[PDB]
From a paper:
We inserted cpGFP into the canonical family member, E. coli maltose-binding protein (MBP), at four different locations and performed high-throughput screens to improve the linkers and other sensor elements, resulting in relatively bright sensors with ΔF/F > 6.
Typical metrics for quantifying local structural perturbation, such as changes in solvent-accessible surface area or distance difference matrices, identify residues for which the change in local environment is defined by the three-dimensional relationship between residues, but not their sequential relationship. We solved the X-ray structures of these sensors to 1.9 and 2.0 Å resolution, respectively, by molecular replacement [Fig. 5(a,c)]. As expected, the structures of the cpGFP and MBP domains of the sensors are superimposable with published crystal structures of cpGFP (from GCaMP2; RMSD = 0.36 and 0.38 Å, respectively, for comparing 221 common Cα atoms) and MBP-maltose (RMSD = 0.43 and 0.37 Å, 370 Cα). The structure of MBP is largely unperturbed by insertion of the cpGFP domain; only residues around the 175 and 311 insertion sites show any significant displacement.
Residue numbers in the entry: 2 to 268, 275 to 338, 342 to 617
Amino acid sequence: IEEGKLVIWINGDKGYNGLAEVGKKFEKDTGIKVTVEHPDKLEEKFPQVAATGDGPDIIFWAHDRFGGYAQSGLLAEITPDKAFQDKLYPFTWDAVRYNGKLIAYPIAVEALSLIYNKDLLPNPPKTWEEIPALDKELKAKGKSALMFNLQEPYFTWPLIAADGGYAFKYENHLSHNVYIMADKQKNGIKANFKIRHNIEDGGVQLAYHYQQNTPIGDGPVLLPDNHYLSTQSKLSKDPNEKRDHMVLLEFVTAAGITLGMDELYKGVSKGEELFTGVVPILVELDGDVNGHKFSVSGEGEGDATYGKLTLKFICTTGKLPVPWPTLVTTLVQCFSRYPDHMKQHDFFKSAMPEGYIQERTIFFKDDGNYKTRAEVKFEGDTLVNRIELKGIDFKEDGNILGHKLEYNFNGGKYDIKDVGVDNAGAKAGLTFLVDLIKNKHMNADTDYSIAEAAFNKGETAMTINGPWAWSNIDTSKVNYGVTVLPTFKGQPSKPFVGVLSAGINAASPNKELAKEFLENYLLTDEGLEAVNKDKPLGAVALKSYEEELVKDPRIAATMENAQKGEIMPNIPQMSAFWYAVRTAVINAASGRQTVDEDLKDAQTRIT
Ligand SMILES: OC[C@H]1O[C@H](O[C@H]2[C@H](O)[C@@H](O)[C@@H](O)O[C@@H]2CO)[C@H](O)[C@@H](O)[C@@H]1O
């Protein structure tokens, strides 16, 4: 990659001539040349060429591809300052966050709308179900009802998702519950639970945990009734830290015993006093996994009144030989928030200051096991967790010693084993589409060019497209409207919402130049206007400019369809999702197999 200039890749359906104008302004101010290209298949080309250390400085695509690029080490982390972050909408920054890092600049929000010819169809349809009849009426007059790209599953997905189709199931319960039981003959507690570790490229690695805790001291402890600890964890990194490390934020609350009405009728351990405020924490772990010896040190603080832990861990021996997420559980349940009515069940604090021994065995399914023994106690003002870990029977090339686990915890934000492409709602929607074809209301071979030319020539009354398409319709002089997509079985069509984003190649020697361009030239009112005037971007990420665009009814329609849809995940598994659904739609549409069979195939490919 040549130093001292910028090469930018953007898709050929976007305003690349307008983006080139912004490049020319950058060159007028700086002397630096900005070359804008639109290669074919750039979303497949980029990971190929970047993996060898080549390609553009800056890559534009919808946000859904960027997680995969990021997981493959192809994107530089961006760290705009807070003054710049405040210029863009938070919804858009969320779309470019990946396992704790911002991995691109967001540009604009894209959602499909129904685009209609007001001369042919002054009142467009509310439902998919009425389209066959409208088509029959229009065909009698030499026109058709609807043409849109049937080759890319982006454009059929709104109908597939309408009555219940989905890619990956969003985890609505992000806390993980660990059930605590009294262990009377150890005068302590025990627990067993499992952790899910997403594997890169798909699949889940299970870690079955078995735990026993015993007081160090001879003083009385609290032995609890059955209950649980509900834990949420967030793993991140410190941009200024050069060693191998993990930043961890956790929140933990006890639950599972409801107060009875008898307790209202006519209606704390000494160790608990040590946890009324912020307590410093130190963690030290000496480990040996298949003979690979390592040490970890951690420091931070706990606040049991919130159930909150904030810690940074460092591998003090160089590269950690196992993945960080596999050590989270091993690396202080005394910081749990127990509700007042449950505090007689808090073994962990009752054992302080002398502390407890915490022992586990952790079995990684179809791989090795960890055995851990820890002393958790106060040393002065500080709560210290000192751990010995021994790992055996691991595969040197397996998910743990081969570092094949995603950097997230307990499955992350989507259940990548729960795919919705072959459920009743997906089948109903694709069956409707295939029926449209069977009944000669659409043609299986229609693609983007064919549909755009028919709509822009006034041959078809409707199309389905994004904001980028509007300028060619303008040139055509068709009198058009942009509106809400039709309903299916009374439910909104649910387009997958994209955020056009600009990522920086990890191998670029022009990372600062790229940030200067993106922050001070593109992501300005004048920069966005220049692209927008070429091909409309949609609902832009820059607040100041979006305030001008919201008076356009086409933007209002875009937003209404975005609201009814769902933001695309940016998880690495999205690439497999889209490949599978593409094949399923093309095959079902051309009659190659039935709808049921094709969606079942898709589902098997993805999982
Ligand atoms: O069809 C699968 C395809 O859908 C999306 O791509 C969109 C893109 O977001 C729009 O900006 C535009 O160019 O149309 C594309 C459909 O042809 C996903 O972003 C993409 O990853 C996916 O492969």
